[PDB]
Design a protein around this nucleic acid. Structure first.
Ligand code: K
Ligand code: MG
Ligand code: MG
Ligand code: MG
Ligand code: ZN
Lengths: 62, 337, 132
RNA sequence: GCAGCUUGCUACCUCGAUGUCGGUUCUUUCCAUCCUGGCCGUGCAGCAGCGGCCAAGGGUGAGGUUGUUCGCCUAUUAAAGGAGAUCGUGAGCUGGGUUUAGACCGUCGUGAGACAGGUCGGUUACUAUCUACUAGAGGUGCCCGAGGUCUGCGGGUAAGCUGCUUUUAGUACGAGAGGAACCAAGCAGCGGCGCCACUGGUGUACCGGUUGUCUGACAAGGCAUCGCCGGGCAGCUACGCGCUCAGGAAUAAGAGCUGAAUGCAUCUAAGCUCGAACUCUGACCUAAAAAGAGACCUCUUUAAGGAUUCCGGUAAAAGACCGGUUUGAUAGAAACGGGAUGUAAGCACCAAGGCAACGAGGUGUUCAGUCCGCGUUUACUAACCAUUCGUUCCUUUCACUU
RNA sequence: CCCUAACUGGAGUCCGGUGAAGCUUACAUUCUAGUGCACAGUCUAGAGACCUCUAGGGGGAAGUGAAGACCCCGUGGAGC
RNA sequence: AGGCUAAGGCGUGUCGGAGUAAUUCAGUUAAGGGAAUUCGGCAAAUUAGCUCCGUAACUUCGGGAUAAGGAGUGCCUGCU
């Protein structure tokens, strides 16, 4: 069972669920839900979004 | 005229598409015995769906040996009671009920369905059935069972559901001996079905009420300019000029769902006793949590949650011994997410 | 053809103009029909990843243009599920020119190909730089 | 000779109107069979053809031109058969064509005007009485009274049909080139039935951002399509997911066995064995209103039990259906779990700058605030109080009571 | 359009109030075939059919609306 | 203009209740494809204000022209 981390929120994908998104340059992004995929498609960066682990890391930098 | 062909809209194999006459599915056929005596059917209640990660053990499959995610239906299967033994006589006009003996002690909530048979004739009724079998008046024996939904909490009902189940045995005397062994006992789903085997599921499907031909039969919508001329979800024609009538085969509105349906070759992926193994975080939506022993059926099953699902051993199964599934992960994540 | 392990929706129907992502000189091809596809009344021919289609070269070189060719779709934006429950989707649709047997006419494929076509057509797999 | 699917002939019906062509939608039938099944012949090595016989169960599609029918063409395809149903189908649709009034071109005519040429434009009425069908109810019939479980006279089904690839096998066959079949596996297309763990859509619950304006400002709100934009649980849904065999019997064409007429021979005249995607059975759905109107068991005859009221939803257009009702988790509240959104207001500090007043905004308090048409715990409130039928009604045409 | 889905408001559906019109010789629960002015719910022979009610789309009643505007005929008109 | 509000006029563009089917009138949204629909892109969608840059064939020299095609735009602070 492959352990996969959501690219946006940083949550671990539960097995049998979630999405893999592949860009043209071969870059692959795991999405745990449709919400993370939508926020990724809006151009939002995870570090600017407070509820994600990268947003929490950026805020906790202070 | 040169015609474009289309398969007929829907199946006429389930006509008339009326409401099922009971909330319980009735089995019209029973398979043949292939071993020791046992009940050929069981009844549970549908809880909901989850999915498991299992190793694909299906022989010859492309994904055999690797991890696959398999949707499953969880069905609560509390022990059923064997309420009665019924003997049948076969003649030219088919089977007729000839004898019945009820178990001496029956559950008090059975009164919600029927007035309780007394603890009267059981030895003499059984000896009457034995005499009838010896004199050749009996063609086969069936067991009358009922569920006890009071132990469940997602199913609100306390009134049992009563149905006849076949007994699988090599001979009629063996059937009678086994039925006398099981009469009045509580049979567990492990005493009927084994893990990894195929079964047939019967239930009354989800009721949708009165539905139009587009949803009921899958007729085409009106297309293009016709979509906005006033008949969008209506059938194009009801008939020809001759014959001067609407055929019963013309798709029309009516009751949709709440029919009896039998599915074939649904594999049991796990027989469980601890309901915490399958209940998700936050519970099953609109149901709650599994409490007693349950069963995991691969894929979908007819009916919504809380419907009685009848399980019988397969009548048209193809594959031989499948094995015990290797369930690596049962998903207990929130169905509400 | 040999079955794939994944379930692929036939996302592209006839008339779809798909970017061709090999070095054969075809930039945009339009699906005419789908090989090994019998349809039903009113249904357009449908193609998902791993399918071979008859195409018409809409853009590209003058030599390639207006030619009826065979192409295999290797990327699709419509999500498809792998056997272990993961759903995969690409950023765009892509195809590569091939023959009947499935051998690419080009030599390099810019961009990632789906693993399913890589198994169903091993030469597309070897020709591609990365398989996702 | 057949058919009546082309065009004629005819004038029997219809001129107090049976609405035209083509397409579309939906249903059905025929077989003279295009494919799929079974066969026979071959100038049939195999591959593949050609010809014929049985067979109508299933399939017979997508596009460019043209109003087309028809036909041509394109790429798929197992094949992309033909025809009937008022040239099926306008109280279903469409309106491209034809078939009104306008106008142009050509031709004809002195002219008005005409054309079986072409061209541009040109209103598609009705609340369903009966019948038929699709579904849903109330009765009466049958019937100890009631309930439950069955049976199955019957009705229906395509519930499956068909390809590709692998294997057999680069084998049989063939000089080579080429190249099969039984069995076996997987996948796919179409069809059918169901389902919502997953994924997608929606989600006028909900959460947030923001424009214009109004309620004096902040805060909180109204309105502008839900103002718009972003996200989205439940539910529904498909673009998602599950299941979708045979086997047996009896046959068609046909191939044979035995077998006489006709000493032999003969598949046929009796008899017998095989033999199809057909038929039957088997699956599956439905079915005591099967008038032969069913079987069995249980409970009880002032009862069994049913309905109404009550709290509901696995059900639901009305009816019906399925449940619970204190001996209770049926619904709701409360809290908690599980979720949605995205970090509330106020306060403090910072803020480009401004002498100041102010100051969009940033940071902390704060994964906060708000919200949940899910669950759990929990009788806290509400499932209480009734009513009604199971008696022909009054009567003493009484099995009784002042 | 492939191929439809969900949702919003108004109808519809169900309830209270109000309250018309249009088809109609009669009968009428039909279905098949034939027959017959050769296109029958009523004739003939069969086959079916227990009655009432509700909803529903329009197969049929050669449904209803209009003494056919197409064609011909009339020792009928009108305009040109 | 449109939107939101005064004043003034109204809740009488004079039936209500209920919230549960199909269907229907009018709307919102819609994966992937993008005219494959259709007689025909009918209907719907796209674009859209203002400023600046830039603007073809052809032309009766008037135009075509807003051709086409690009960039910017809110709020706050201080100013010229
Ligand atoms: K036809
Ligand atoms: Mg009609
Ligand atoms: Mg005369
Ligand atoms: Mg109203
Ligand atoms: Zn995530």
């Amino acid at each position: 069972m492959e352990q996969r981390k959501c690219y946006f929120c940083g949550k671990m994908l539960e097995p049998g669920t979630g999405k893999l998104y592949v860009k043209k340059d071969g870059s692959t992004y795991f999405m745990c839900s449709s919400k993370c995929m939508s926020n990724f498609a809006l151009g939002r960066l995870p570090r600017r979004t407070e509820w994600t682990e990268k947003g929490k890391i950026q805020l906790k930098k202070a | 005229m040169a015609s474009i062909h289309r398969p007929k809209r829907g199946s006429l194999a389930f006509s008339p598409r009326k409401r099922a006459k009971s909330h319980i599915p009735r089995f019209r056929a029973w398979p043949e015995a292939t071993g020791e005596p046992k009940l050929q059917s069981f009844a549970g209640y549908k809880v909901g769906m989850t999915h498991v990660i299992m190793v694909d053990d299906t022989k010859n499959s492309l994904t055999q040996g690797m991890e696959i995610s398999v949707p499953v239906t969880v069905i609560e299967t509390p022990a059923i009671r064997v309420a009665a033994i019924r003997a049948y006589a076969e003649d030219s006009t088919g089977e007729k009920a000839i004898a019945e003996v009820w178990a001496a002690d029956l559950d008090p909530e059975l009164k919600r369905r029927i007035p309780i048979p007394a603890a009267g004739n059981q030895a003499e009724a059984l000896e009457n059935i034995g005499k009838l079998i010896e004199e050749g008046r009996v063609s086969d024996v069936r067991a009358v069972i009922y569920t006890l939904p009071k132990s469940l909490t997602g199913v609100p009902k306390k009134v049992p559901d009563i149905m006849e189940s076949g007994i699988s045995a090599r001979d009629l005397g063996t059937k009678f001996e086994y039925s006398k062994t099981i009469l009045g006992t509580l049979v567990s789903v492990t005493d009927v079905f084994k893990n990894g085997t195929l079964v047939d599921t019967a239930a009354i499907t989800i009721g949708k009420g009165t539905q139009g031909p587009v949803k009921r039969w899958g007729i085409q919508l009106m297309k293009g300019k016709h979509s906005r001329q006033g008949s969008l979800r209506q059938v194009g024609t009801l008939g020809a000029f001759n014959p001067s009538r609407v055929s019963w085969r013309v798709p029309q509105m009516g009751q949709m769902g709440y029919h009896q349906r039998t599915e074939f070759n649904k594999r049991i992926l796990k027989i469980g006793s601890d309901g915490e193994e399958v209940t998700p975080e936050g519970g099953f939506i609109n149901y709650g949590l599994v409490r007693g022993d349950y069963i995991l059926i691969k894929g979908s099953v007819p009916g919504p949650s809380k419907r009685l699902i009848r399980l019988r051993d397969p009548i048209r199964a193809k594959k031989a011994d499948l094995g015990e599934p290797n369930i690596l992960y049962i998903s207990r994540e929130s169905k509400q997410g | 053809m040999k079955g794939m392990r994944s379930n692929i929706p036939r996302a592209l129907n006839a008339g779809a103009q798909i970017a061709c992502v090999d070095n054969t000189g075809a930039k945009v091809v339009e699906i005419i029909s789908v090989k090994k596809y019998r349809g039903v009344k009113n249904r357009m021919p449908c193609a998902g990843i791993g399918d071979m289609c008859v195409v018409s070269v809409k853009k590209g070189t003058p030599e390639m243009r207006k030619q009826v060719l065979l192409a295999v779709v290797v990327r699709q934006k419509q999500e498809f599920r792998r056997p272990d429950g993961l759903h995969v989707s690409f950023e765009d649709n892509a195809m590569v020119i091939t023959d009947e047997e499935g051998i690419p006419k080009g030599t390099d494929i810019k961009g990632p190909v789906a693993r399913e076509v890589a198994e169903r057509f091993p030469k597309i797999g070897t020709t591609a730089s990365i398989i996702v």
